[PDB]
Amino acid sequence: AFSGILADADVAAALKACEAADSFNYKAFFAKVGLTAKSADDIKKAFFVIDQDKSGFIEEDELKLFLQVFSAGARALTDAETKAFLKAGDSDGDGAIGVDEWAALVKA
């Protein structure tokens, strides 16, 4: 696509910055790709893309492949990275990230 919510270049840069195992930080990633500066609706659209199986929730397994949703050839997040990511977003402790938790997590 010629134009989209996020610029391919920013996605590439955000991905490059966290290539090393255990170098991922969601705030840094969101900042670099430009998601933090988007509208609540755009943030929600990102939620649907990450929710690969359309269960209406982002499960730990989808966090593991979080980078791939942005860049198909990206690595999988390590268990430490996925667990920290889940802990950060899972306000209600149910083991997954719902739409409002996602919106709250991105802060936009």
Binding-site positions for Ca(2+) read 51, 53, 55, 57, 59, 62, 90, 92, 94, 96, 101
Give the three-class secondary structure for 5.
coil
CB of 72 to Ca ion, least distance (A): 18
94 binds, among Ca ion, its own copies, none (CB under 5 to 8 A by kind): Ca ion
The stretch among 9-17, 23-31, 60-68, 73-81 that binds its own copies (CB under 8 A) is 9-17
Concatenate the DSSP letters of all residues of 30-90 into one string: HHHHTGGGS-HHHHHHHHHHH-TT-SSSEEHHHHHTHHHHHSTTPPPPPHHHHHHHHHHH-
- Is 79 or 92 the residue whose CB approaches Ca ion more closely? 92
